[PDB]
Amino acid sequence: DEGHITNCLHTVRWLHTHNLKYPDARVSGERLIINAPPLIPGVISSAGLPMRMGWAHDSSDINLAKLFGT
DNA sequence: AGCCACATCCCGGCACTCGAAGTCCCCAACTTGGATGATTTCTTCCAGTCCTGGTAA
């Protein structure tokens, strides 16, 4: 089903490393993809963690995004 | 060696004591024997309603 897979391929455009909408769903615009900052000895942060991505956009997609973003 | 600034130092001076009875010492502080049985601990029915999405067809 090229249509089902096409709808799934489209979700890739909004995979991100950092989520600009987290505290408030009203924020509108582009995604953010950045490598973790250099480690600071006195601070707990993403600097000590491996690279991972997530997904946010329409409520409807949830299932269709799972093929490539898992 | 002679001259000047700044430290303190000791005598004359000053002010206070201050109303107005005493109130007992010393050493000791208990051993033993037992704390109960038999029975039972509730049942009927019920457990609100409405407002407060973003995104794309």
Q: Write the single-letter amino acid at A69.
A: G
Which of A16, A27, A55 minimizes the C-alpha distance to A64? Answer: A55
Q: Write the single-letter amino acid at A8.
A: C
Residue with tokens 């997904």: A55
**Cα–Cα distance between A35 and A60 in angstroms, integer?**
29
For residue A59, say whether its CB is under 7 Å from any atom of strand B.
yes
Residue with tokens 């601070």: A43
**Cα–Cα distance between A70 and A67 in angstroms, integer?**
6
Nearest-Å Rg of the Cα atoms of chain A is 15
For residue A6, say whether its CB is under 7 Å from any atom of strand B.
no
- State the method: cryo-EM
**Cα–Cα distance between A6 and A19 in angstroms, integer?**
24
Helix/strand/coil (H/E/C) assignment for every residue in chain A: CHHHHHHHHHHHHHEECECCCCCCCCCCCCCECCCCCCCCCCCCCHHHCCCCCEECCCCCCCCCCHHHHC
For residue A58, say whether its CB is under 7 Å from any atom of strand B.
yes
**Cα–Cα distance between A57 and A14 in angstroms, integer?**
7
Resolution of this model in Å is 3.5
